[PDB]
Write a protein that binds this ligand. Structure first.
Ligand SMILES: CC(C)(C)c1ccc(-c2nc3ccccc3c(=O)[nH]2)cc1
Ligand SMILES: [Zn+2]
Length: 209
């Protein structure tokens, strides 16, 4: 049921998504081990992901959450990187896309920092890097990320020193780095229907000059 619609680079929509990508790159405490060494991306393509069934699944859950949270969906646009990006855009998020060993519990994780999600494109810890070169810092191979609509509802705030159920009375967890003041938040949901993979971004990381 999914169709992908290319956005033109001359479109404000493309430009806004690229700006959110580029402006949320940060340095990581692993010195680039997982995601590579880079300060910016080369954006190759941005596609809108259209699936009526997955969209209706998402809005039905958003409505349930919104009503449970006194008419506040607390909806965000957040990044998600995963080796299962192809499966997600076709079948939606589900328990197979959860990070069982994540710090904030076994759920599906999303990032405000695009570079945080970039660390998971090739798997946990960057896996073995790109298929072709086995390089986690590969500047040649094409990567893909999702920029997703995520319903947080009542979110449990967990400060961090950097499929399960939600904390009782909560629909998500907000993981907020308390040591690195330039690190943005990470968010966890425990139901696949609380996210919709709205944009598919194809890119390369760029070698710093
Ligand atoms: C275990 C699998 C391979 C299914 C998996 C594990 C973790 C992520 C994942 N971690 C994240 C952790 C924090 C913030 C964003 C992300 C993110 O963007 N992605 C994706 C897939
Ligand atoms: Zn490569």
């Amino acid at each position: 049921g999914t169709i992908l619609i290319d956005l033109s680079p001359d479109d404000k929509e493309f430009q806004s998504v690229e700006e959110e990508m580029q402006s949320t790159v940060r340095e990581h405490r692993d010195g680039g081990h997982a995601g590579g060494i880079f300060n910016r991306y080369n954006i190759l393509k941005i596609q809108k992901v259209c699936n009526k069934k997955l969209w209706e699944r998402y809005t039905h859950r958003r409505k349930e959450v919104s009503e449970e949270n006194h008419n506040h969906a607390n909806e965000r646009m957040l990044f998600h990187g995963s080796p299962f990006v192809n499966a997600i855009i076709h079948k939606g998020f589900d328990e197979r896309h959860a990070y069982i060993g994540g710090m904030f519990g076994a759920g599906i994780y999303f990032a405000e920092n695009s570079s945080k999600s970039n660390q998971y494109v090739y798997g946990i810890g960057g896996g073995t890097g790109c298929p072709v070169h086995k390089d986690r810092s590969c500047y040649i191979c094409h990567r893909q990320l999702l920029f997703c609509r995520v319903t947080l509802g009542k979110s449990f705030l967990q400060f961090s020193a950097m499929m399960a159920h939600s904390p009782p009375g909560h629909h998500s967890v907000t993981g907020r780095p308390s040591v690195n003041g330039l690190a943005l938040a990470e968010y966890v949901i425990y139901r696949g229907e609380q996210a919709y993979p709205e944009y598919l971004i194809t890119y390369q990381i760029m070698r710093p000059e």
